[PDB]
Each structure stands twice: as C-alpha cells, then as structure tokens.
Write a protein that binds this ligand. Sequence first.
Ligand SMILES: *C(=O)N(NC(=O)OC)c1ccc(NC(=O)CCCCCCCCC#C)cc1
Ligand SMILES: *C(=O)N(NC(=O)OC)c1ccc(NC(=O)CCCCCCCCC#C)cc1
Ligand SMILES: [Mg+2]
Ligand SMILES: [Mg+2]
Lengths: 277, 277
Amino acid sequence: GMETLELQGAKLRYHQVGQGPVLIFIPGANGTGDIFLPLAEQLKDHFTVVAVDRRDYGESELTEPLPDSASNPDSDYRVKRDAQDIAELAKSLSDEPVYILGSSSGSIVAMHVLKDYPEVVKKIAFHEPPINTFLPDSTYWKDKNDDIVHQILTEGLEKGMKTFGETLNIAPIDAKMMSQPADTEEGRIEQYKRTMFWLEFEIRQYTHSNITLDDFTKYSDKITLLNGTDSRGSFPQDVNFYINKETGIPIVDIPGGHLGYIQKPEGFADVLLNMWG
Amino acid sequence: GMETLELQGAKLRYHQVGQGPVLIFIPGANGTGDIFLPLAEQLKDHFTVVAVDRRDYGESELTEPLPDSASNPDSDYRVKRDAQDIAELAKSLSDEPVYILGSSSGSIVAMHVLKDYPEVVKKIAFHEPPINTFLPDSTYWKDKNDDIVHQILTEGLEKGMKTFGETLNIAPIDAKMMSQPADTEEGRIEQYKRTMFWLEFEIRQYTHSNITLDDFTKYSDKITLLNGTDSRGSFPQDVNFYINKETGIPIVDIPGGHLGYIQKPEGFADVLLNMWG
Ligand SMILES: *C(=O)N(NC(=O)OC)c1ccc(NC(=O)CCCCCCCCC#C)cc1
Ligand SMILES: *C(=O)N(NC(=O)OC)c1ccc(NC(=O)CCCCCCCCC#C)cc1
Ligand SMILES: [Mg+2]
Ligand SMILES: [Mg+2]
C-alpha cells in the first residue's frame, strides 16, 4: 500500500518505509518509486525513506488534464510542477529541511527543487543528471534529443503511411491532402499526435471489427454505398464492390476522392440530394 | 460555439447547420466534423446537418480516461462507444430516425450504428469503408494493418531507444536492464505508454530546462554529485564533471551504473550512509 498527498491537479502517491530523517527519492524515466524499494530496505533503520511516483506515473493520478501546451518541447510546466510536488511532500512530512536524491530526469526535478524551494532542502544529491542546458556544447546534445524524438513520434509514421497509401492504392490527391502539414508548429504537433492515436487505437480495432454481410442484408433498403470518382482503384472501393456483389446494395458514384466531401462539396451535395432530398 | 451533448464518459461536441430532417456526418481519421462544413452549406436548406467531433478528437472531451484494454488490437470498446454516441445524438435531436453518412473509419462507426441501434436509422450511407472483416482476403488486409502499426509504434520505438542509448554512451549493463520487457502483460503495455509519455512530455522539456551554473553555486554546500562506478564514459557523468569543473561541487562515486540503486542497493546505501547518515 502507498501513501497519498492530494495536491493541485494530482493525487501524489509514494512509498514510505523506515524511521529517521526524511529522505525523498525522485525517480527518472521509469517515473515510479518502486525502483528504490530494495535501496529503502537498506536505509530504513536510518531514514524515513520516501519513494515517489511522480504525478504522471504509476499509482499517482492527475485530477485535471495536462495543459495543451505540455506537448511543446520548450514547456516547463511539468518539471516545475514535479519540483513543487517534492517541496509540498517534504513540508507535509517534516518541519525540518529534508534529504533528497534524484536520478536521471529525477535529478533534474531535484535541481528545480533546490532552485525554487531551497527552504525544504537539507542536503541534495544529483545522480547522473542528463540536463544539457548549461553545457558549453548544449546545442549538440539538445538537437540530438530533439531529432530522436522527432524520428519516433513523427518520421516513422510518415514513412509507414506512405507505404500504407501504396498498399491501399490511395489516390495522390487524397494522400497529399491527408498529409498536408499544418501551417503552425503547434498544429503539426497535433496532427502527428492524432495520427499516432488513430494508429494505436482505431485502424486495427475498427477495420477488423465484427460486421458481417448479414448485418447489411437485414436493412438493405436503407443502405447506399458511395465510391468517389477521383479515388478509383483504391482499396475502399473494392470493399464496396464486394458488398454490392454479395448483397445487391447499390453503389452510387460521387465526386471527389476519399476526401470528396471537402474537395467537391457542391457535386458531393448534388448526389446526396438526389439520393435523399 | 460548437454544440454539446453530455454522454457517459465524454462531452460530445458537434456542428449544427440548417433545418429539416437530421443528417449526421461521421468523420474518418481526421476525427472532426469541421471537414464537412463546406458540404453542410450546400445541404442546409434540406437537412439539419450535424457534423460530429468523435469523442477522442477535436473539441470533444473525455471525462474519464480510455480503458486500458482499448490498446488491444481486437478491442471493440471505442467503435461501439462511437456508435452509441451517434445513436444518443440522433435521439437527442430527433423523434424520427435520421439520415447518417460516414466516411472511412466513420463509415465503420455507421455500420455499428445500424447493427446495434437500427431504430435511429432512416437512411445510411457508407462512403469508402475500409473494413476488411468479411472480405474473402480479410487476412491479407488485416496483416498489412497489423504490420504497419508494429513498424511505426513498436519497431520505431525500439530502434529509437537503442539510438538514444548509443548517443548517450549508456553502459551495456544499464541498456539491458532499462530495455527488459516487464514480467506481466499488464506491465508491458504500461511500459510502452510510459516510454512514449516520457518521450513526448519529459525528455526534451527536462533536459533543456532552465538551470544555470549559478543555481548550483548559491547553495553549493548542500549538493553532492553522484557518478556510478559501472557507468563510466556515459553522458550523464560528463554533465557532473562539467558541474564539478565550474563550481567545485564534489563528485562522489557510488556502486552500480545508471540504475545502481537497484543493481547494487547494499553498496549504494553504504555510500549514502557515509554521506548523510
Ligand atoms: C479514412 O479516413 N482513412 N482510412 C482509409 O482510407 O483506409 C484505412 C484514413 C486513414 C489514414 C489517414 N491519414 C493519413 O494517412 C495521414 C498521415 C500522415 C500525417 C502527415 C505526415 C506528412 C507526410 C506523410 C506521409 C486518413 C484517412
Ligand atoms: C533516466 O532515467 N534516463 N535518462 C537518461 O539516462 O538520459 C536522458 C532514462 C532514459 C531512457 C530510459 N529508457 C527506457 O525507459 C527504455 C524504453 C525502451 C522502450 C520501451 C518498450 C515498449 C514496447 C516496445 C517497443 C531510461 C532512463
Ligand atoms: Mg519532420
Ligand atoms: Mg559507513
């Protein structure tokens, strides 16, 4: 069982083991304090060992969404909020300044605790910090971090989606429109996030969901299949051809390609009005 | 402003234009109804046009997080919840069954609306559906989808994290341990989410955060820098060497590598006790 400290925007969960002065361990990229529990066992007759799940990880829980801007690479919201969490935790557990150790990005949180809340620090240890900002070659290291994130979060998708368009023989006009970069960096961040979400949570689950031809035949009088005139040869049209061949449900051709409703709204509307008006 | 329907677990936002029978447009991968607004203008004399932001997209908001199982590639949670959202929207706006058009994955949502809530459907259109489940060659298309997601999400991350370890000259013992798949399937999916979160929301923001050398000198007496004995040559140790070079703050060597506190807890503790006990 873990302890809870309720703070602005999160329930902060932590392990607490031992007796003595408070010693707070701040984890790095794993984000959870359980990685310190073997160490806590070694220290528990000397310190009250406090091993934190930082608020975005483990058994901690946000009570309010992150700011939209947190995905921006120069946001400082999260590191400042993590540092304030440690300061409030220290104050909640001790009337004296406490001992603090962070490792990896947890040591960067520790630096911000010292910077913004020196009053809670008795002694502090930075174990293998990967901060580059004050290095004489900061640019070199910053750009490497930026580029490897960009590779995983945006470039893998870009290359895979081009192949996927070929698999499905998507028309070039649709591929260009579906991949057209937004005109702001924030808009582009959001575009890539949305595609990464659709990849993980939508494409497989929806395209192999439990629909049978029998589901259509029960209500065939209500159904129209639509094929774009500018997306001939693409996989979705083959799906409609199969439905039609097996069920007789009609195919209506409609202007534009996969994105025809915004490519050719007037012609698209004219067909819908013919169908249903 | 966008209209709102409050549903279980989400606030569903949608555009509403026109008068006449309700016509609901369900978007595909872009997820948002704004892509139908030029079309809605052509139809607004004949239909009440309703263009939905599906609940995971746009101005719609989840009021509780996605279930953990939504990550499963055969999960039906999201597609069924999207179809129920459309049915509830129809019922909230119309006493009569309504007209519905979906495109791409939005046409799959439309198929589930017809299957599970046929009572809300007057007429329905499936614009370029990419569902494969009932096709004779379903397996070919399913496997292509499974492969492109694995390539972008799993292979992209694995290769990128190996490059990150090389860039920082992480010691082999550390690389192995930090890349070890969890011992429980619950904790493997969580490891993916946690790594992607750290990649997007932590590494760049924290490693280029606002710490200066002068921040260390102000309270230098409080600080210990810690370098692992088994992680020599790695970038985080170079950060500590630079801090030491500029500030005189001592470096203390401690057993293990980057993860030395769990690799060698006894020896790690012995050094902390020498420091602070
Ligand atoms: C329908 O709306 N679908 N699916 C479909 O047609 O069949 C499955 C759909 C699927 C995927 C997308 N978007 C997409 O491919 C764009 C991703 C690229 C983002 C921008 C990257 C720029 C360079 C590249 C490539 C749309 C529709
Ligand atoms: C500190 O704890 N760091 N930072 C550091 O050393 O320098 C910035 C840190 C950084 C990175 C990790 N890596 C890690 O968590 C491994 C992730 C591997 C991929 C996850 C597998 C998911 C499924 C697939 C593919 C640790 C520590
Ligand atoms: Mg790019
Ligand atoms: Mg001793």
